[PDB]
Symmetry: D2
Subunit: 406 residues, 4 copies
């Protein structure tokens, strides 16, 4: 309450109000909120005395910005992505970076369901025509989704949810994953990708962005899809050979597609968009909105705020993307924490401080990345003894930062 | 087998092959099939010795055509509609007309589900832009369907199926119907339309075409919808005031819409299409395809063929749209039938024929519209006695037609 | 209202109150109700001026009783069975007999579910012991129902409901039926009975009582069941060779059983019960209560009352067990009905009455069993003309009875 | 492989074979298996060189037995209970004790479902009579489960599963829990117990054994149940006032009950059983078999074996019932562990060993109960250096035990 009032939370780019509700319910009310992106100079001014900052995709938390933030304890990327933030620079200063990598699984699943529905029915095509005054009711090849085969690639958080929704619509779900998984409902793992592609009326992609998925769907892979099928991609902009796809649409080997993500995307609603696909009416083209809904924002705000709250209240760095992960249950005494370089001697030095005072260490957890180490410490002591100890902890060769959580 | 070979079935406009499978399985193989619309003179030539004709929307079974068909027993409209066929002229000659009014409930339901999904997510709009090179990711007002309220108007065959699919997607279903109905799953009847319209995020229409539904959704009704909601219409082209709708889209009172049907529709894929709505990207415009899928055609072919088969095998006119409805279970003896004008005296005359011969009438069913009457008759007799009886039946004052089913 | 007050309904053996609610809602309030079985002399006195009687299993509607009932139009067996009623004697006097053959499908299904649950767990056995002071927790061979195979014999009204409940419990359902059927959920028809019996952990019987099911489960059939399995019978008391069953329990080829029905059952709660099975604690023995619940009584009361109401209001004999079945939709004019012996000449005579008066017969339906015939007749006329006509109808050689429904 | 062959696993009282499959799949094959309970002297002989022992309810792991086990690393109670094992004595020697507290949730849920089914239908009662030659079909008060209200007390692992099964049967589920919980399906938390008891047709108990649940259902609580309802208890033998219950059965305030657990239970199938309830046929009495099925044994064997495997492979004491809980993810280097008395100085001493050698501690986790502490340690070193270090670790004042996992 009286200590907490003094911990400043800088929220920019308009994170969801639910984030500020969590913050207040946890006793943190010292919040500077902005709907808009702070510019370089107004950012440097606002972050200067900020304990935490939550941000989105437009803010550039850069080495200099981070290096100028003089009280900064942690960073919250209220989004999935994290590239606007310099993870190493935050690391070096003992600043863990949190985010929300699966707060939007429902949004993406629905989008796919809706897309394959209309695609199977030649609707994006007829609808482009109708707005042009041409009326082309072409029913010969339209189908109902029920009874048909969905091929999911990437049976992860989104894939599994997709498969469930697809079963409610009466489709048969099949998936390919580089690792083996336990199916839900009547899903079915398929061993080689060749079989999936062959038998699927609809193939949808839910994989991550790395070298194994780069151009994963290319001319060869596409021509294994069954004639007249559909390809949907709302995963990552690098997973599909757009020009191969364009060919297979022009040759009518595929009856249509939907793409929500591209190799390069406009930075802003006011930049021009370019794609070979723009020429096909039977293709649905969406500006990276797969995970973009009000519900997704509510989730993101709740999660990431919670993480910041937890790290502040008890030091947990579980799921931090730039730090070593550590969490310790609450039990009586005082908790302290200490970040430092990963060198022989530190842990002892740290512990020594307590032994030589005859203080009982109740629990301790320490984890360590290539160059850094972080460690939480519970101890049975007076506030007096803790403070003094903090000081001594700060002194230890290799110490980056330390703190007395309570 | 030997009698049946001689009963000709004229199929035009390419009805589904399943129709010809039913026909053959029932022992009828004398089929003249055409994928295309026969023209007036080639129609008059093909129908001339045809016992049955199945057709679709393009054929004009007109008084003259019907009057020239010299052996025509019944007509099968392999479609929902029936306006290409002159019902009275068929009636007058004792020709019942069958059709398929609910073979496509799934198709329409899916279309709606797919449409409200993408509509809720501003997808038709972003996708029109993307094809124009403009990239407008506008997520502030996009929602997931789950948790939201669907208002169904017309809880009939399609409505009930819609409500079920919508519940699987996790929506709350509410419906308004001029008559009271038993809800499925967790549906909920709403008493006045005002409440439905007020609370619904999505309103979809599944009513018939008559004077009570004509312009049913007009400026007043639309402005009772909740701000930012969606209106979908895949029922009949007369149910929505297109210009009121256009206003409510231009004023952003509604966030979007989908319309599959219009007051006047192009006769052909090669005619121009016109609507005030063509100017809104956030509106989905589809060329009457609600019920247009391969599955729907399979159903239609199965149903209507079955009806023709039944009427031919046992005289049932259940669901005939231009005749009085009659059906009688099979039990031993000979079945005969007789169509005639609805006048005093006929039934007696008909029965007299059997009494005076000392023949036992086992069963009989007679139904009667304003001017016509139809009656099936089972009797315990020899083929010899039946034939003679048929003759006498033909003689009866007011007789239109008669037949000895077996 | 004024005519209806005069139609007496005699209800004995305490049918459910819902029966009297239907009766009153339909405008019939002249009801003599008895919770108890009327005895021969008090029955003859109460039925004497009764238009309808509803009864249960204890009343003996016999030839004499029926022959003494001087105003009796129809009989309602508020039960499944009908053997206390002399069907032919009722027939001869043109009295249709209704009943309720599937008002209790849920009750029987639940009973089976509950029984196989406890049987699989050796519970009836441990529980007989516990009440005797012996404590025998014998878990080696107890199983959960989930994952196990239920074999249903008789995939009829009860079978299908059973299969559904069993799937909710996570069992695999298989069925054998002498006729081919469309499975629900994931049920599975099995061709020969041998396969069903072999693979089933639990076999339950839901077949009718006739010569094909008599002793259907006998020593040979039982020894095809898988070792340690269970047999449940709540169908008919003649379907299982009780002594074969007794052997297979004594040899531990079967781990247990439940039987709700027997070749001969005590007439009364005060008669002694005898069975070879009484000696096995691992057998559940229930006194024909499969369909005995308050809900079942509510259904029975609603159905059978409805039927009586329908027959009285519009003459329908649909599902009558002793009459020829006939039903006709309502359309303007006056309805009359006529029961008579199945002889040449009657129908004409009947129709003649209307022709010679120049009255238009709007509809007519006539059905005919081996010796009897029943026929409903709509006609366009004045009340005056109808009455006179009724009289003439009564006159017709072979006439048993006639009536002017409205 | 070569090290693992030398780690002896002593399994007694016939744990499930799946336990030995897990053991072998993990590379541990040195197993001494016994279907039977070893007696004191044959136990002391077999455990003498045993690294682990798995046991059930009959074995008395006592201070002396434990103190004589000279190589004993951990104990596996392949059961829920743990009272045959002296937890403190195991603790003092740094022996964690594992068990399986929720491997049988399905078994107990099914038992309840089956019991309330037959109870609602007066079946245990009619069935006791039938075996005595008396036939009492008493249907007036029998009900179907569907539509009825189940009151669950203890919405824990078993409660939640129960509620799900009950919903599939079409019941309405309500629960009371001393803590607040998130409902599944359409369950419903009820605030005071008074409301639950009042509205429930069936009340079933799934709470733990402690002072708050002792005699929780007593005369007052029972008389709040609705007249004619049922009480089921398969939780703990101390939760229900058996004599109050007996009164409420004798007064017909309750229509029946099922009890699987008692204040004192026979030690053996050959001991006599005593209860006031034995006198009521409408009560189901089962010898503590709620969780007793073959599936439950498979679960128990899998879990507990897994835990032993984990503790042996990586030191995890997660869910140990007598130890402080600690778990650490795998990452390169050597893992060691150390149990010791909870005194100032130890951790430093331990760490010192590595610093002064210039060895980098990669991770460390330490947890601490009232008198004991346990700590796992990863370190970057040679096997040589690890061994030497182990030795030094063993030397530390207060050290109880230490080990070099790999
Ligand atoms: N369109 C949009 O706005 C959004 C896109 N996404 C993206 O969707 C993707 C999936 O999302 P999540 O389910 O959260 O991912 P996840 O991590 O839960 O699942 C990824 C799955 O892919 C599998 N996998 C990895 N490489 C593979 C390969 N080469 N071939 C086959 N399977 C492979 C993994 O085993 C895992 O099951 C992510 O890339 C995420 O960034 C997420 C949210 C929104
Ligand atoms: N877009 C397309 O290609 C297709 C459109 N349709 C049309 O959809 C409509 C509904 O189809 P079905 O479910 O088969 O109809 P249905 O006859 O089964 O149900 C119509 C329902 O509307 C109710 N109703 C009638 N007038 C009403 C009013 N004034 N206000 C509220 N409720 C009213 C009726 O009580 C009934 O439940 C029909 O007009 C059908 O022609 C059908 C197939 C395809
Ligand atoms: N225990 C009790 O209190 C009650 C017993 N029942 C009895 O249960 C039986 C079934 O009830 P419902 O489902 O209403 O009957 P149902 O008539 O709906 O189904 C009977 C089924 O058995 C099949 N079948 C007939 N003979 C067969 C044979 N030889 N082998 C295999 N299948 C055969 C038929 O195809 C049909 O599907 C009836 O006998 C009924 O009287 C009904 C209510 C209560
Ligand atoms: N009959 C048998 O063979 C078996 C009996 N059991 C027993 O069943 C009981 C429940 O099992 P689980 O679901 O695993 O327990 P659980 O620990 O998962 O749930 C116990 C629940 O009771 C609630 N609770 C505790 N005290 C309460 C009180 N005073 N009033 C209302 N709620 C209270 C807790 O909040 C918790 O939700 C345990 O005692 C277990 O030992 C378990 C297996 C077999």
């Amino acid at each position: 309450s009286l200590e907490k009032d003094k911990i400043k939370f800088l929220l920019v780019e308009g994170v969801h109000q639910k984030a500020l509700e969590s913050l207040r319910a946890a006793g943190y009310t010292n919040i500077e909120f902005h709907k808009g992106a702070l510019d370089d100079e107004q950012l440097k001014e606002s972050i200067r005395d900020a304990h935490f900052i939550g941000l989105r995709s437009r803010t550039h938390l850069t080495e200099d910005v981070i290096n100028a933030a003089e009280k900064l304890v942690a960073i919250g990327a209220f989004a999935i992505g994290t590239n606007q933030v310099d993870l190493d620079a935050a690391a070096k200063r003992g600043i863990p970076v949190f985010n929300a990598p699966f707060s939007n699984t429902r949004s993406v699943a629905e989008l796919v369901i809706g897309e394959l529905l209309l695609l199977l029915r030649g609707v994006p095509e007829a609808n482009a025509k109708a707005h042009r005054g041409v009326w082309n009711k072409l029913a010969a090849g339209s189908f109902e989704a029920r009874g048909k085969k969905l091929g999911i690639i990437g049976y992860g958080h989104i894939g599994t949810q997709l498969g469930i929704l697809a079963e409610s619509l009466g489709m048969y779900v099949y998936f390919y994953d580089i690792e083996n998984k336990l199916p839900l409902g009547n899903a079915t793992q398929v061993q080689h990708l060749s079989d999936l592609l062959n038998m699927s009326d609809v193939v949808s992609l839910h994989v991550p962005e790395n070298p194994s998925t780069k151009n994963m769907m290319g001319a060869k892979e596409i021509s294994l899809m069954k004639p007249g099928s559909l390809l949907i991609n709302a995963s990552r902009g690098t997973v599909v050979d757009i020009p191969a796809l364009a060919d297979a649409l022009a040759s009518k080997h595929l009856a249509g597609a939907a793409i929500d993500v591209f190799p390069t995307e406009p930075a802003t609603n006011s930049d021009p968009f370019t794609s070979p696909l723009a020429e096909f009416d039977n293709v649905l083209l969406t500006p990276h909105i797969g995970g973009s809904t009000q519900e997704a924002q509510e989730n993101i705000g709740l999660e990431v705020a919670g993480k910041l709250i937890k790290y502040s209240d008890n030091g947990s760095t579980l799921s931090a993307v730039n730090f070593p992960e550590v969490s310790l249950p609450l039990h009586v005494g005082r908790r302290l924490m200490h970040i430092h370089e990963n060198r022989p001697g530190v842990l002892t030095a740290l512990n020594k401080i307590f032994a030589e005072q005859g203080v009982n260490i109740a629990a301790q957890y320490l984890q360590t990345s290539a160059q850094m180490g972080y460690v939480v410490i519970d101890i049975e002591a007076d506030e007096d003894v803790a403070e003094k100890a903090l000081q001594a902890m700060k002194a230890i060769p290799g110490t980056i930062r330390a703190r007395l959580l309570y």
